[PDB]
């Protein structure tokens, strides 16, 4: 890739350490993922 995906890894790891069910796991990456592309505003 060319964009700091560096900060998205982080995003993702945290999101699986929530003690969260798997539901709110799920949202949560998929929600850095989408929130890491730019114009997304």
Same mark, same amino acid.
């Given at each position: 890739?060319?964009?700091?995906?560096?900060?998205?890894?982080? +995003?993702?790891?945290? %999101?699986?350490? *929530?003690?969260?069910?798997?539901?709110?796991?799920?949202? +949560?990456?998929?929600? %850095?993922?989408? *929130?890491?592309?730019?114009?997304?505003?």
């Amino acid at each position: 890739s060319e964009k700091p995906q560096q900060e998205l890894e982080e +995003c993702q790891n945290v %999101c699986r350490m *929530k003690r969260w069910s798997t539901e709110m796991v799920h949202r +949560c990456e998929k929600k %850095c993922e989408e *929130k890491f592309e730019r114009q997304q505003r």
